[PDB]
């Protein structure tokens, strides 16, 4: 039952007006990456 | 507050750290008043006189620390899935904390530390134990909404209080034990309202205010003590001792009022069964305080003869004369109270 | 008396304690003037500020020379 | 990544912490894992600040109480235990290769690092503990800052009136 | 009247006397009490218990004063508490809606034969 | 947030001492939902604010996306352990550094 | 009649908690606005 | 494995009434068994400490089942589910409290201390009232619980308006 | 967060050209570039602070890039060895590009820009002063009020308190 | 879920803090060793919750200044104890 954008048709934001665009997550952004370009980004004040 | 200025600081101290807990707007916030609270309370109890006092420093310490520790634990547990200071639907995370609060104040399944520490106190600490170490526990309590944890602390509470009190013949065990029943009428009285435990509470500290300046004024620690205890008057002797029935809240007397109003409204809200077995499990209670009467009551004794003579404190007397006189006469005054109604 | 006594056994405190109090001193005519000028208001803000010229702020900007 | 190897020597460190009988031994254990704690922490923030205060305030506590042990339990004995050293060892290779073949994207905690927040957040471009550190000083909070100032002021005059210096020194009788 | 109006019932109509003791009971009951306090006192201390006068008539006079002071709190904490049920009553009309006075021509319960 | 009984002045210490009212992404989300505890009381308040409290706390808690987040990775792992996928297009085209 | 309908309104408050009388705790935001107002005198401040 | 007892009517569902006791009986034996083996007895051994979390609880768990059983049993014999059943219940239980015991006494009056237990709560099932009802009146406050405010920090103005929106 | 109904603009629309000029070039016209696009700039910095969407100010943004990249082919048209040079050495001088180094080369640039385009260098403490405009957006955020209509009521200070009808009501009157 | 792979550690963590604590040690300074080993995973869990918000990391002083007071208090104790029973050994404490 997933559809795009909400946990299984449960919106994440109730109240928010329509078409309110919300940031996503850090880690939501990169949900469909590998872990080289993740710590490509968090990791540049340590520096590996 | 009895032989240096440095202690009338610790307990000015330990009002301060209580109040910042009952007036603290979230868990943390009341956290760290049991912080301040717990520092001002162990320098007042330790005394390197007795080497019974610092044990009892020791013991409350330990359990103290965990407690709050405990406490800090599911606090930061419970808004961390919430992130409120209240659960919408109490859980066993609210449970938790229910857990260390009952641990804080020597509740029931819990309270073994709470006796076993009173060997080692004057009579002066008792009482600030006993009274004032109680607001804060129990008073965060009553934001937490489960009822079969703290439903099943009262029944223990009661049952525990009383049995155990039976064996005891020190004066300052028994009356831990007879504390730990007073504490589970509280925990029953907090399930169903506060205005009741706030009026039953202080009724409490009444009672527990007189009977400590009695043994504190005297000195007696043990029953043997009370029937060699020496009083001009026995009519005197006999009265004073009249304060155990209040203690035990029997109607006639002051005591009972505030076992009264629990009752009026525990059965108000349908909560029967409780009342069954904790006023059946009073009587226990009541038992012992006789044996205490039995010093009184009888009113001729075989008593050591290199006594002719009572020495006693003034003001303690003054002031415990007057809270004497109400908690035998104090009925008739319930029609001026209006904090009930 | 006692500022000969503490002057003879403990003179860093006395010494010290004269340059603290000059602190509190100058700490009061520093922290007086700050507001005698209106320092709340500084011309220089971090990070991009851009007011609309009927904000009430936007009357106060502070107009200075460099 | 070393969040995963932080993760599995934390853990390491307090299974044989359970174990610990001597002072010491519990003393070494615990200093080890207050570097491992102190440097996890800072992952997860916008800065070390804290981790500096941490390892600054907790090494005072370390020195004192080995003056205490010294004088309290100085005649303790260690036991090594074939039986503990096999299992942390055991398990510990058993954790660090769970760590090479994670999903350690998904293991990543969530907080925000000062790198992870957006490039549009102004607030993130001052000093680096200019504002978390801010309000500590600041209306209405500054007076619990005082609050403590009292309760530690109050706990010195404690310690001193517990301690009673005049009636001697402290030795284990 | 035949009607069950709960607004009605609270309502007050000054009708009711109040009993003589009534306004005169809480300051003469802590007056005794006072004056019995400082008895046992002097009791208490085997002194004379009618000397020292003053301190009974302090503890009687303060028992006085602090009785009327409650009494006159206890009444506007009373009064406000009606108003308070008053005001309820009127939020929600439906809650507490009029019910009509039945007797016992319209109704059948049961008796108990003893035999 | 709990509401002390006793409220003497001693509440004004602490009442500030965590808060989301600084910078915070959900400093306006928590305002309103807090602001209709205060209009209906915490007690009738808990049956009024299901809205306010679910998008407060999916913004703090943020479980309700992070727990988005694992239904997509483990369904990404899922497909590939099933042969589903390949080892050469196992993940997408990463995002560029500068964003977000 | 006053001891049994007194007795039935309160039932009524502490079902639903609809009045603040007895069957109420008030919840206070005023310290989070005092919060958000010193934020936002905080933010004027900001610079040099 | 979740059973609750009075799911179903008197004479019913055995396995489900089973399990529904045996719960209580399990977890009563162990709060106490927690007790007996720390602050009372203090067993030495790893498995001597199993024989008096067995010895706490095993028997327990036949009381409980002696006592659905007979209870059970009695329903369908006699052809009705009445208090009777549940005081028949109560003397099963007490039968095996002198097993356990070894006295036969004390098996005798326990009975009757739990067959009048069983009778007081088929009386609660059957009449329509609880033991430990959720409270109907839960007080938050005294009369002035939203009057008396104490606090000294001006509260800066509102947000919300009592009034009917505008637009 | 992001689902089908959420309107994006389409891949062509964000296309733009863009600078794609390192941090050390950036700096040195810094100054120069700043009085120019300051009219671009103060209005995409002003939408973006009080309206937070960024597809809101797509078009405003365009605007910023454009303006940045037609100063430069000023630059590229005229000064291109001076600017090299101010750059190369910003760049090589120091590990932050402190403008306190280059004050030399610096000078070679700000003679060559006013001697071709008549530009003055902005005071240092320019561009970090508040900046006042003129909203061309024209959309300040509006200020409205929640309501509640059905708030837990409170008895009103005007509603009258007549005596108890017959008093406490406890027992026997007491 | 959620809290079993970002929560899960620090708890587990915490309550074997605690059995330390209770464990059966000669000295009473076993205990006070075990005291600050639960505070430093006390404020690992603190730290999670307070960066959940932007910031409040601020609170830790506040923590850290109680958890000294509670070790500098458990230490104090410590030392009374010396000075009237000689020794600060468990077994050698009244068992009441
Ligand atoms: C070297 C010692 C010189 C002789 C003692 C000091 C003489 C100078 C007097 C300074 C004021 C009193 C300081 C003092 O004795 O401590 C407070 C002493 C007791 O010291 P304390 O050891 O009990 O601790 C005091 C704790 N507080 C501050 C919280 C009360 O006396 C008092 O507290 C009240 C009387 C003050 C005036 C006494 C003169
Ligand atoms: C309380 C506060 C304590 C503060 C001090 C903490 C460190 C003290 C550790 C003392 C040594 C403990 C020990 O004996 O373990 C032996 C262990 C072995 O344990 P063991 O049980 O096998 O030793 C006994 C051996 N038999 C059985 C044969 C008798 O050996 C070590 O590896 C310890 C290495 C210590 C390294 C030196 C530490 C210096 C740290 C400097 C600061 C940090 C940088
Ligand atoms: C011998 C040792 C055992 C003694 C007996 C123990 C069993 C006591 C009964 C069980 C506890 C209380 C039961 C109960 O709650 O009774 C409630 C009953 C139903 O009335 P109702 O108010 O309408 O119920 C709620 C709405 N449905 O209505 C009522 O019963 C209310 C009237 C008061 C009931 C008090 C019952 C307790 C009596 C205890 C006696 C103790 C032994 C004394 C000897
Ligand atoms: C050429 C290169 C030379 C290199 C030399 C390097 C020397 C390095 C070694 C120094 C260490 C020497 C030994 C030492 O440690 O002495 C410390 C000093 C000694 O003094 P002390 O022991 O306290 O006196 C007896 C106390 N019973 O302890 C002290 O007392 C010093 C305290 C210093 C206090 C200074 C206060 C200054 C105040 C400034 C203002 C004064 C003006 C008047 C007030 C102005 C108010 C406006
Ligand atoms: C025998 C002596 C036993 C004393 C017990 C006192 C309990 C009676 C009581 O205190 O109230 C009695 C009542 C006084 O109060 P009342 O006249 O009803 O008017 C309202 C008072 N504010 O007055 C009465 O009811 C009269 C009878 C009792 C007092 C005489
Ligand atoms: C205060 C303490 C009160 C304790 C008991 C209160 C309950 C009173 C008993 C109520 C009752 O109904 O008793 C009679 C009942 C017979 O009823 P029944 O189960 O239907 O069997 C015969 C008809 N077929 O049979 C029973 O309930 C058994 C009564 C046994 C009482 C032993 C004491
Ligand atoms: C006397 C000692 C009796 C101990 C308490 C007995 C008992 O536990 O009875 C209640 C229990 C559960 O019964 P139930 O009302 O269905 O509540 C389940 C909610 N989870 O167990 C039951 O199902 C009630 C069975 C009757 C037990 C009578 C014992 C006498
Ligand atoms: C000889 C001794 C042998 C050894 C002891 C054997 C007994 C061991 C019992 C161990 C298990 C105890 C824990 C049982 C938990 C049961 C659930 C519970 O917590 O109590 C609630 C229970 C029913 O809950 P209730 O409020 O009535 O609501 C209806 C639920 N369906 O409440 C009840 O059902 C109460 C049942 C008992 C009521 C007795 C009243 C009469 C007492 C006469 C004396």
New interface residues.
Partial sequence: GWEVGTWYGEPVFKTLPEDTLVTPIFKEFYAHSDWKSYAKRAHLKLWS | MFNNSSKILFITIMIIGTLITVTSNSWLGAWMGLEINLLSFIPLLSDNNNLMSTEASLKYFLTQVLASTVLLFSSILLMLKNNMNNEINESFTSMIIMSALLLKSGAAPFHFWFPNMMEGLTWMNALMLMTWQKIAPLMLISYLNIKYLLLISVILSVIIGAIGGLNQTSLRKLMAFSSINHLGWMLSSLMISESIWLIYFFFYSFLSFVLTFMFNIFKLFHLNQLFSWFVNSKILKFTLFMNFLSLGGLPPFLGFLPKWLVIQQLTLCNQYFMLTLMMMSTLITLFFYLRICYSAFMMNYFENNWIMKMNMNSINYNMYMIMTFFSIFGLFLISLFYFMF | SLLKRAWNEIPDIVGGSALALAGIVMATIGVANYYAKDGDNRRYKLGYVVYRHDDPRALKVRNDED | MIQLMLYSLIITTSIIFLNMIHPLALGLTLLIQTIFVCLLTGLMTKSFWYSYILFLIFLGGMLVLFIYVTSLASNEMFNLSMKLTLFSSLILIFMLILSFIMDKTSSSLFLMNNDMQSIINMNSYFMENSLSLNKLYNFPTNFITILLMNYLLITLIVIVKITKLFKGPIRMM | SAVNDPLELLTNKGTHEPSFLSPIWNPIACGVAGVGAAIFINWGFRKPVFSGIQKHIAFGAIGVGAGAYFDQKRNEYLAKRDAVLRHYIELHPDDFPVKERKTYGQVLESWVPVR | SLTPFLRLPLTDLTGCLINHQTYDKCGKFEMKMMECFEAYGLERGKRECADLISDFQECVGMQKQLMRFHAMRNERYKQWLKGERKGQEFFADPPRVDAY | ???L???????????????????????????????????DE?E????? | LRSKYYDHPDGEDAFGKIVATNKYAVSAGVAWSMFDVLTLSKPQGYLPTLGRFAYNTGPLMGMATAFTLTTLVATNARGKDDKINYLIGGFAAGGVFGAWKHNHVAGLCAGLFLGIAGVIKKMSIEQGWEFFPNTPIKQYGGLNIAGNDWTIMADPPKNWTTEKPKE | VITNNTTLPEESELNVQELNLSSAALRAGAFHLGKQCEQANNEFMLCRQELDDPRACLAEGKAVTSCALDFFRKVKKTCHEEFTQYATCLDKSSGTMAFSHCRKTQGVFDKCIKDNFDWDRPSYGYFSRAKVIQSAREAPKKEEKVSYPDATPGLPEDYPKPPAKYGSRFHWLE | MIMILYWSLPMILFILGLFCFVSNRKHLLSMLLSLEFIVLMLFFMLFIYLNMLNYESYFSMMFLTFSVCEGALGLSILVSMIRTHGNDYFQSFSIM
Avoid: C, F, T, W
């Fill in positions: 009649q006053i001891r309908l007194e007795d039935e309104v309160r039932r009524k408050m502490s079902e639903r908690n609809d009045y603040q009388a007895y069957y109420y705790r008030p919840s206070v935001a005023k310290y989070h606005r005092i919060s958000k107002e010193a934020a905080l004027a401040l900001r610079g040099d």
